[PDB]
């Protein structure tokens, strides 16, 4: 049985992880921009 609360929590966590991914790229871009 698919827990509806868990399903939303897990996919909303994925969205949070993706924002973290974007933050890592911003850091990389900034470092390269300094070169």
């Amino acid at each position: 049985a698919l827990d509806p609360i868990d399903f939303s929590i897990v996919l909303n966590k994925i969205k949070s992880q993706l924002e973290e991914s974007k933050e890592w790229i911003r850091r990389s871009n900034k470092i390269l921009d300094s070169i």
Partner: protein, 48 residues
């Protein structure tokens, strides 16, 4: 020659970085649509 190679690697990584942001944004939208699909099913299952 070394400075040129370094400049090339910087250019390459900037391009790789662009690819990752594009990918990240795409997965973010897909995740939102899967949530929307789950909501549609649960709200569509009520009568049936």
């Amino acid at each position: 020659h070394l400075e040129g190679e370094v400049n090339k690697i910087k250019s390459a990584l900037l391009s790789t970085n662009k690819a990752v942001v594009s990918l990240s944004n795409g997965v973010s939208v897909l995740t939102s649509k899967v949530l929307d699909l789950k909501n549609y099913i649960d709200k569509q299952l009520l009568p049936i």
